[PDB]
Ligand binder design. Structure first.
Ligand code: NA
Ligand code: NA
Ligand code: NA
Ligand code: NA
Ligand code: NA
Ligand code: NA
Ligand code: NA
Ligand code: NA
Ligand code: NA
Lengths: 229, 229, 229, 229, 229
C-alpha cells in the first residue's frame, strides 16, 4: 500500500510483523557558490569525482569548459555510467553546481578532489572541492554542503533488524521481495501476509473445463458440419 | 431447414442435389360404424390385430369389455408395444374404432382378424374385421376404410432414387443422417453441402492458447500471493 | 458483390463491362452400384485412378480392403495429393463409390482403370472401371455415370471472351484478380470500376500530420515534466 | 439529384425543362491480340499516338521495351499529359494493348500510327496500328476495334438543343453550371428551378442582429469586471 | 393540401366541390439565336419592351451595351418594375435572349419592338423583335418563339366556372381565399369545408377561466407575503 509493496517467488505461507525505521538514501551535494557566474572562469586543472569505491573519469579543465555550465556538461557526461548527474542552482550567493547520485547505501557519498593549476581563470578551481568526511549539511550561504547523505535504511521483521542498502530488497524473507516506500509510525508495524495458498488452481481447472469442453464442440461434434444451400 | 434437417458423423466434403418426391407413411384405418353405439354390446369372440410382421396379443372379448370404449381400452394396452393406438369417432353413421400405427414403410398396414362366437350381445363382432388387401380409402358412410396407407417414401440424390422406410434415414450418403420433413417442388431441388474443416483446427485451437496462457497467472504468478495490512 | 469479387495489385484506372457465361467445373463421378453391398467382397486386382495429367498411386486390392468401405478408405488416402475424395451412396440399386476431384478445367476428368484377377471375392472388380470418354451423365439405375463434367468457364470483358480453367482468375485484366461466383443474366452485364487514387494521397497523409503534431507534446513539451507535493 | 447536379454564380430567377438525350464520351480502343504473348517480342520501330489535336511524344521501340508490358509502361508515361493510359487484356486470342483517353467530345479518338523496321523480334510492330476512321466497334476475336467512341453529348433546354463536349458544362444557361450524370427518360423531362433570394437577406441578417447584440455584454458590460473574495 | 391551400376572413359554413382545370400562366419568350455571340455587336437603335398594358422604359442601344450581355443587364434593370427579367441561353444555334414576366393572366404577353438604325455593329438589331400575335411556340432552331403563354387559369365551384388571372384568388367564394397549386384529376374533385365554430367559444374561453383563476393567488393571496428567518 503506502508503506510497502511486496511480491513472492516460491516461499512458504506465513505472517510477519514489519517495521520500517528508515529508508535507504542516496547522495546529493552542493558545491561552493560562485559569485558573478556569467563572467567567472575556472583555473585549468583536473576534477576527480568519486562515489564510494567507484571513480568517475578524471575531468580535465581547460578553456573549452572552465565555466559552471561547462562543468555541468562535463560532469553529466562523465557520470552517466555511475548515475551521477549535475545541475545549477542560483541563489543569493551566486550560482553553484548540484550533484546527485542514484546509488543508495552507506558510504556512497559524492566526493570531489581537485587539482588546480593555479592559473587559467579569475576564480580558483580548488573551491569546487568537496570532502564528505568534513562537509556539513547544506545551509544558506556560499559555502558547500551535502543535501542528503548516502545511507542504509533499516527494517525489522518479527523483531529482527535488517540494514538495507536499497529500498528494493529481496530474500530478507526467503522468496519474498518488497519495495520499502515509507517509514512506519512508532510501534505501529505492518502485518505482512504471505499466502502460499490460492485455491485458484480452480483457474487451472478451467483448462480441462475448456480443454475438454472446447474440444467437444469444434472436435467430435462439429468436425464435420452440414446444412442446405 | 424446412424440408430436411441433416447431421454428420465423420464423412467427406461434397455437394449434393436432393429431391424429395414423397414421405414414408404409417397405417391409419377406420372400422365399421356401429349404429346406436350407446346401447351396443359386442358378441363374444377374439380380436387378432397385426401390423405386417408384428402380431398383437390375442384380445378376448367378454362381458367386461364388449363395448366400443371397452375395445378402445384393450387395444390401447394390447398395442403399446408395436405403436398401435385406438380411439372412437362419432359421425352421422354412429361411432367406430379408429386405429393408428407408428411404423412407417411399405406393408406395415394394420390388420384386424375376427372370430365371432355369434352370441354375447346385440351387434356382430365380425364387422370389426379389416383386410388391408381389400379395404378402400375411407369415405363417408358406415363402411370401413383406411385413412392413410403405410408406405415407403422416396428421395433422389444427384439423380439416384432411394426408397425410404422412414423419414429419418441414415447412410444413404455415407456418414450423413437427415430427417426429411417435406417434399421439394417439382424441378426445384435442394443443394446439400457437407463441410469438414472451417477455422480448422484454429477455432478450438484458441482454447489451448488460453488454457496455456491462463496457466501463467493463477499458476506460477499467483502460486504464492502477498498482502499487507 | 454476389457475382464477382475483385482485387488489385497496382494497375491503371478504367471501366469494364463483364459477362459471366459459365463457371469452371471439377469432376464428380459415380461408379456402378453393387448389389447386396453388405456381403459383397471384391475380386483381387489393381485400381489405377487418374485425373488428366495427374496419376494416383496404384491401388492394390487384397483381403484387407476388398470392400466398398475398404476402397473408400484407400482412395481417400490414395488421393489426398490430387484432391480426389470418395464416399458411398446407397440407392435402390445398392451402394456405389462416388468420387470427386477439386481440379477445375477442361479435361480434368476422373478416370478409373481396372485390372481384375477374376478371383478373390463374389463381385467383379472390373465393374468399377470408368472411362470419361464413354461415360454418360449419371441417371437413376445401377449403371455408372458422371455427376459433373470438369470444364473451363467463360467470361467476356468488353466483348472479348476468355475461357477460364478456374473460378479464381488473374491478369485477364492486367493487375486485377477476381473470383467469379455466379453467372450474369443474359444481356445484363456487370460494370467493373478500377479506381486508383481517391483522397490520394491525403487520406494516409492525415497520419504524418499527426505523427508530426503528436511529436510536439510528449516529445519537446513533455520531455521534462514537473510536479509539486 | 441523380441525373444532374447544378450550381450557380449570380444569375436570374427562372424555370427550365431539361432533357438529357446522351452523354459526352471519351475514346477507348483495343489493339490486335498478340498470339503467345509470353514469348512475343516486337520488331524495331516507332509509335506515334495522338488523340485529335494532341500528339504524344514519339515512342521508340527498342530492345528495352519491345514487349506488351514494355509498351504499356511507355504509353502510361508517354501519355500522362493528354490523359492516355494503357493496360493489357488477356482473352482467348492472346494478350492485347487497351488504351483509354480522358478527353470527352467529338473527334477526340485515340489514333496509333506505326513505322515498322521489319526486324527486331518475332511479331510485327505494324499490327499495333489503329485508324479510328476505319476501325469497327470491338467484337470477340484477335482483330482490333474501339470500345467507346469519343463523342459530344446532347441536352435540350425548353426545346433548344445543345451539343456538349463534356458532361460538365457551363453557361448554357447564363451563370448556371451543372454536371450531367444521366439520361432522362423519353418524354420525362427534369424541372430545374433557379432561386435567387429566399429568407433574403434575413437569413444572414440574423448575424448582425447578434454580432451587434453580442457586443453589448462582453463589450460595454464586461469591459470592466468585479469580484470579491 | 397539395392542390389548393385555403384561408378565411369571416364567412359562413358550407361545403364545396372544386375542380382545377388549369393554372394561370405568365409569359416567357426566347428571341432569335445570334450566330457567333462571342464577337457579335448590335446595330444602333431602340428597344421598346411591353407586357400588355405596362410599357418598359425605352432602351437605347449604343456602344456601351450593344452586346447580348449588354442587353441582358439593361432589360434586368429596365424591367424591375413590371417583373421582366432576362438571361442568355447558349444552344447549337448560338446565344439568345430569354425574357420572363411574373404577371399571370390572359394578354400579359411580353412584346419586343425594334427600331434599327441599320448600323453600329455586325448583327441586325431588328432580329430581336417579337410579336406575340405571330410568334410560334419555341422549338429547336435559331428562330424565336414563346416558351409559355400568359393566360388565365380555370376552376369550377359546384359546377360553376371561374376564369382566374392568378393562382392566388379571393372572394370567388365570399370571404375565402385559396392559392391554387395544382390541377385536379379528371372527375376527381376536391371537397372544401368551411368550418366556423368548433370548441366555440370554449377553446379560447379556457383562458379567462385561468386569467380569472390566476388572479386569485399572485393577486389577493400573494399581494402580501410573509417569511421567517
Ligand atoms: Na552555505
Ligand atoms: Na369407406
Ligand atoms: Na365409409
Ligand atoms: Na447412369
Ligand atoms: Na445409372
Ligand atoms: Na473487333
Ligand atoms: Na476483334
Ligand atoms: Na421557334
Ligand atoms: Na426556334
Amino acid at each position: 500500500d503506502i508503506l510497502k509493496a511486496s511480491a513472492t517467488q516460491s516461499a512458504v505461507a506465513g505472517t510477519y510483523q514489519i517495521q520500517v525505521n528508515s529508508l535507504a538514501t542516496s547522495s546529493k551535494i552542493a558545491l561552493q557558490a560562485i559569485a558573478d557566474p556569467a563572467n567567472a572562469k575556472f583555473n585549468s586543472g583536473t576534477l576527480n569525482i568519486s562515489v564510494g569505491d567507484t571513480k568517475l573519469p578524471a575531468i580535465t579543465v581547460d578553456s573549452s569548459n572552465n565555466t559552471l555550465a561547462g562543468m555541468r556538461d562535463a560532469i553529466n557526461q562523465a557520470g552517466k555510467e555511475a548515475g551521477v548527474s549535475a545541475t545549477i542552482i542560483t541563489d543569493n550567493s551566486g550560482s553553484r553546481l548540484v550533484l546527485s547520485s542514484t546509488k543508495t547505501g552507506d558510504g556512497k557519498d559524492i566526493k570531489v578532489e581537485v587539482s588546480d593549476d593555479g592559473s587559467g581563470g579569475n576564480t580558483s578551481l580548488s573551491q569546487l572541492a568537496f570532502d564528505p568526511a568534513t562537509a556539513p549539511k547544506l545551509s544558506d550561504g556560499a559555502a558547500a554542503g551535502y543535501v542528503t547523505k548516502a545511507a542504509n535504511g533499516e527494517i525489522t521483521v518479527d523483531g529482527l533488524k535488517r540494514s538495507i542498502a536499497s529500498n528494493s530488497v529481496s530474500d530478507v524473507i526467503d522468496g519474498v521481495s518488497f519495495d520499502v516506500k515509507a517509514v512506519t509510525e512508532a510501534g505501529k508495524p505492518i502485518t505482512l501476509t504471505v499466502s502460499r495458498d490460492d485455491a485458484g488452481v480452480k483457474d487451472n481447472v478451467k483448462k480441462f473445463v475448456e480443454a475438454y469442453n472446447t474440444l467437444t464442440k469444434f472436435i467430435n461434434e462439429q468436425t464435420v458440419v452440414t446444412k442446405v444451400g
